[PDB]
């Protein structure tokens, strides 16, 4: 359950956010510059929606080779040659935060790590300060962002 002899709340805690987009296809391979202008008309275009992980800022979808990408920062290539994916808008929403409650601390001036409302001990060992939607909170080594009392940079 716990680690390291730590035994004794309200915090802000945070990947289902969609990023609308499309795909360009021609049997030729690449027009990044005119694909956008083809979209600004509001080669062929079809809607393809992806999700971005708020920490890696990485778009995820089956159309992507390994299911990941990043946005150069202009185009993104898929499984095939002729297909490049491009966003309708070249960012994490700031309306995906919440207020959880797990009480955590071992000594008076020492905090080891918290426990979710499910019961799981996340340790505060080896975490780093991370800015996320403009508010400064720690990124844990397990990979979840929390806004705690806080001394390293991710």
């Amino acid at each position, epitope marked *: 359950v716990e680690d390291e002899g730590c035994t004794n709340f309200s915090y802000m805690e945070l990947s289902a956010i969609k990023v609308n987009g499309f795909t360009c296809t021609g049997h030729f391979r690449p027009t990044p510059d005119a694909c956008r202008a083809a979209y600004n008309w509001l080669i062929i275009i079809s809607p393809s929606v992806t999700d971005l992980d708020p920490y890696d800022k990485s778009l995820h979808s089956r159309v992507f080779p390994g299911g990941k990408c990043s946005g150069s920062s202009t185009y993104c290539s898929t499984n095939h040659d002729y297909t490049i994916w491009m966003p309708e808008n070249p960012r994490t*929403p*700031c*309306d995906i935060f919440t*207020n959880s409650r797990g009480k955590r601390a071992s000594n008076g001036n020492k905090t080891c790590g918290f426990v979710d409302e499910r019961g799981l001990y996340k340790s505060l060992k080896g975490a780093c300060r991370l*800015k996320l939607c*403009g*508010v*400064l909170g720690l990124r844990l080594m397990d990979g979840t962002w929390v*806004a705690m009392q806080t001394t390293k*940079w991710c």
Partner: antibody
Amino acid sequence: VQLVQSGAEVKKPGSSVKVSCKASGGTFNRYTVNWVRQAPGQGLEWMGGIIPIFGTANYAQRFQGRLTITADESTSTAYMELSSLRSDDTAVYFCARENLDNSGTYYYFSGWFDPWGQGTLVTVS
Amino acid sequence: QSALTQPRSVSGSPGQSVTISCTGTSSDIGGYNFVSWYQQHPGKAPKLMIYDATKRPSGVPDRFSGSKSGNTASLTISGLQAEDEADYYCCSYAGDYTPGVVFGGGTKLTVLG
């Protein structure tokens, strides 16, 4: 939104102040309360802010451990408590709101200070 | 800390146009930027003029206009009126590693005549 602060205060090298700010009308869910200060004849400086919905407070690197912003939704009152006052802490301390949008487009401490308080002059020595 | 670089003062006669520059605006790795300008009359609180780059709140005339270019930002007052004599501060989002916002030095606009 309408903002009014507590009155002026004269203090002492080594004492502590507490300034207040009560908010009247807020149709906004995503919002934030900040405190910027203004040394006499000098510019503005962001000191720290709070997200009252979650109680999360952010602070500048300076003013570390000397300052704590606490807000209360019930009375819509916010507070800055600065302790261990030096003489160069003589300034006017404004409280400013960030009435952010509920569609999550804008970050939490980007500096969209539309409602401002009248100010609180804190003198030391 | 640091601050945004502004001029110390600009001048204009009534009906003329002036532009206050601002350098060192911050931008996230992924491009989040947020510049804002405030107007402060002597002894009064700051008052918002431009909240996003080139965006105005209600009650601020179209005389006031913002612009962004890289880490630079410019505020333009057109048809300068006497009531525009005040201090002017740009304000930028500090970015990844500095908490909050960073203010500019402040620019004094004096209206002649």
